[PDB]
Amino acid sequence: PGAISQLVSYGAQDVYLTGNPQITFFKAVYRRYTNFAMESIQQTFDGTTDF
């Protein structure tokens, strides 16, 4: 009752957009990734740190 008319009253001009769907916009896709971790680690200066 609103959106339904937009779905049902299909034309020809929209075949390029939704005919033979290639992908589902809805289904979330993510990839599982490698294991890693981060740490902020201080490195030191070799030589005086000044002007």
Binding site: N20, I23, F25, K27, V29
Partner: protein, 59 residues
């Protein structure tokens, strides 16, 4: 209808044996993806598959 009946015996044997002329694809071979589409998969901007639509791929 004896003569046509012997003709039917001939036809039944011949047709029952002769099926092996049309069939589905026979041998399955597995090849790695072309570099472009495989690299496209393993990055972002990858929507889910639909099982169809004959995706276009680079050459």
């Amino acid at each position: 209808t004896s003569f046509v009946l012997m003709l039917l015996f001939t036809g039944i044997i011949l047709i029952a044996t002769n099926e092996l002329t049309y069939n589905r694809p026979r041998e399955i071979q597995y090849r790695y993806l072309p570099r472009d589409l495989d690299s496209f998969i393993r990055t972002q901007e990858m929507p889910s598959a639909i099982f169809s639509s004959m995706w276009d791929v680079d050459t």
